[PDB]
Amino acid sequence: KIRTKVTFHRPKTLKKDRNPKYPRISAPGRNKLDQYGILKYPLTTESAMKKIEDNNTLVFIVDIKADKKKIKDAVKKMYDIQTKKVNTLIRPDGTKKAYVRLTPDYDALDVANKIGI
């Protein structure tokens, strides 16, 4: 054997991927954050109604754990409407609120009428 480096380096040895005999968890967990759990209920305040009328935007109360991507996906699944952009904030009461602006192809007033506000 010929060594050109004075420093000794640990040789590379094979590693094996885990192949457990039994699964630690019997079955995959349930999807807690589904679309129904993501979308709690729409907001029916005066400001929300003004947003719907003017900016073609819906106002929703959403699970605090939900992100903008999940909110967009849940809105699409629930109401079959595209979203131009989702803005989010956490109210002082601790709940998450989302302003979801629909694309021009969709009418916020018609969507709200279908929802039932």
Binding site: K1, I2, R3, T4, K5, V6, T7, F8
Partner: protein, 233 residues
């Protein structure tokens, strides 16, 4: 053809950068390597009492090869052979009315059994590994063999003894009897081993070992001695 030319490199202090060289002797080795080398160095440096020093003189190469090729034909049966013999015996028990079988002749192993055979004077030849760790297990075995008048030899490799007896390692092996066709050669090896080890036990009892310094200090001492001799002549 004329476009090829030599580009010699001038290697030296301040010259062209040297090519890759052998740096093995300068390697910063791991702790295990360093300690196992320093242990050998320390054992060489320190004086070895005669009882331990007697284990440095092993059987010669030719004698060891002859002894071990003799031993290879007395190996104990392996697991497969044992199972095959047991199943044959079970099958033939009732049918053959338990026919008599000749007593097997095989090498004996296991420190307990070897010591018992030596004490009972049943052993005819004892083979002791030179690298037993801890060595207190076999340091007294040469003395016991000498007292019991049992020829003993010290050979290289507990791993080789273990390979003889189908084990990873074996502290020692023993032969209690040999076959008729092998008695003469066994007697030859026995006389050789007795002349090599048993007859030299008394002289080796007083011979200390070790005390060997490093090569560099040896060279320094030789240079000093040469200077002294040149001055004295």
């Amino acid at each position: 053809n004329p476009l090829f030319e030599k580009r010699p490199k001038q290697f030296g202090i301040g010259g062209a950068l040297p090519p890759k060289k052998d740096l093995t002797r300068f390697v910063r080795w791991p702790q295990v390597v360093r300690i196992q080398r320093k242990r050998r160095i320390l054992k060489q440096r320190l004086k070895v009492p005669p009882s331990l020093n007697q284990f440095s003189k092993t059987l010669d190469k030719n004698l060891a090869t002859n002894l071990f090729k003799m031993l290879l034909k007395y190996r104990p049966e392996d697991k497969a052979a044992k199972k095959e013999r047991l199943l044959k015996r079970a099958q033939a028990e009732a049918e053959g009315k338990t026919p008599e079988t000749k007593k097997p002749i095989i090498v004996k192993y296991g420190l307990k059994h070897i010591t018992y055979l030596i004490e009972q004077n049943k052993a005819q030849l004892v083979v002791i590994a030179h690298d037993v760790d801890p060595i207190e297990l076999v340091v007294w075995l040469p003395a016991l063999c000498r007292k019991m008048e049992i020829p003993y030899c010290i050979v290289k490799g507990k791993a080789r003894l273990g390979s003889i007896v189908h084990k990873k390692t074996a502290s020692a092996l023993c032969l209690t009897t040999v076959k008729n066709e092998d008695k003469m050669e066994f007697s030859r090896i026995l006389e050789a081993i007795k002349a090599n080890f048993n007859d030299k036990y008394e002289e080796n009892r007083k011979k200390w070992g070790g005390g060997v310094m490093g090569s560099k200090s040896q060279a320094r001492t030789k240079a000093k001695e040469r200077v002294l001799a040149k001055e004295a002549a």
